[PDB]
Design a protein around this ligand. Structure first.
Ligand SMILES: Nc1ncnc2c1ncn2[C@@H]1O[C@H](CSCC[C@H](N)C(=O)O)[C@@H](O)[C@H]1O
Length: 327
DNA sequence: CCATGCGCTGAC
DNA sequence: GTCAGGCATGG
């Protein structure tokens, strides 16, 4: 994550729904905002959140009376994406994990925050012939919000990961916000190799498969793209090896393969998974952030999470818009 | 709970 | 054709 000198969101209150690791919290707090409520139902996510922020999020949002939620200015929600991902069944709103947006809508209707700030997978914009996104837009419009949606790739915002997500920013109509812009992409100057731990700290992550097939030469020149170097097995998910001189493939939460959740990388002549701290860095988490004691849960958590830096630029622009109030 | 081989998908 | 992006089942 980056340093934010001008605290655009000072004095504003936010809630952290589907909190996970608290990526939205780190991003908005860096812009000066104050968290007043958090909600997350996974036992291990609750633990890591408490380890980092000192508080246990409330559980199952579907059973929370929306009237009990504190007054707030910005509602944040990176809501579940399994039902919308191209790696899943794409049942969408028909999936029990696919109806959480309607809980967001229920809370917005009651609490009427200035801003609603949501994140999901890129496929959310395409799913069901665009109807899924249109449902969200229309729901927010019906609640008297404007709707701004764009897919952003983390590699365009200083983080070496291909991670294309949809970001949906909504302003209450009475605020007359007409100048919200998504942040402009800029040149990437950091690559996977720049975020790696020393070899001595990751020896246990080395995998030596005799069915490794190298399909492409290692590169010496860094590049802002994924660079496949080889495969093991049949080369499905988690069975693909990439160059550290490129960017990381997207981290996953429920993924498998021998290099599960992180993918495999060529490091000093050997192939290995990423360490959870390398996952944190690939998601823009600061080294001060405390990783969950279970490595399996840590990988799941980072796989579900948000890239802090992207959220910081967006949050800064939300604040920039709210603050422009000429006579 | 933790581990891993898929077996498809959207987008080229 | 290519490549990046959760489910099922094993224990
Ligand atoms: N009914 C529910 N109540 C509370 N949390 C829920 C929920 N259904 C799913 N979730 C949680 O919603 C999260 C979506 S992933 C969100 C990750 C978060 N943005 C971060 O910064 O890490 C998951 O952690 C999942 O456990």
């Amino acid at each position: 994550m980056i340093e934010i000198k001008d605290k655009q969101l000072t004095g504003l209150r936010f809630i952290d729904l589907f909190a996970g690791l608290g990526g939205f919290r780190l991003a908005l707090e860096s812009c000066g905002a104050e968290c007043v409520y958090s909600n997350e139902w996974d036992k291990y996510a609750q633990e890591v959140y408490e380890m980092n922020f000192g508080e246990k999020p409330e559980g199952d949002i579907t059973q929370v009376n929306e009237k009990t939620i504190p007054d707030h200015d910005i509602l944040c929600a990176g809501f579940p994406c399994q039902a919308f991902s191209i790696s899943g069944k794409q049942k969408g709103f028909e999936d029990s994990r696919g109806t959480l947006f309607f809980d967001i809508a229920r809370i917005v209707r009651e609490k009427k925050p200035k801003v609603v700030f949501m994140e999901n997978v890129k496929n959310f914009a395409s799913h069901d012939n665009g109807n899924t996104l249109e449902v969200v837009k229309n729901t927010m419009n019906e609640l008297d919000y404007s709707f701004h949606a764009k897919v952003l790739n983390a590699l365009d915002y200083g983080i070496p990961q291909k991670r294309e997500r949809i970001y949906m920013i909504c302003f209450r109509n009475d605020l007359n916000i007409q100048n919200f812009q998504f942040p402009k992409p800029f040149e990437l100057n950091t690559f996977v190799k720049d975020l790696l731990l020393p070899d001595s700290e990751v020896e246990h992550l080395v995998i030596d498969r005799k069915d490794l097939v190298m399909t492409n030469q290692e590169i010496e020149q860094t590049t802002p793209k994924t660079v496949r170097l080889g495969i093991v097995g049949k080369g499905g998910q988690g069975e693909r090896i990439y160059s550290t001189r490129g960017i990381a493939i997207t981290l996953s939460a429920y993924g498998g393969g021998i290099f599960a959740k992180t993918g495999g990388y060529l490091v000093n002549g050997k192939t290995r998974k990423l360490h959870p701290r390398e996952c944190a860095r690939v998601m823009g988490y600061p080294d001060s952030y405390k990783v969950h004691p279970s490595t399996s849960q840590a990988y799941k958590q980072f796989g579900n999470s948000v890239v802090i830096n992207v959220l910081q630029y967006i949050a800064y622009n939300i604040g920039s818009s709210l603050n422009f109030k000429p006579y």
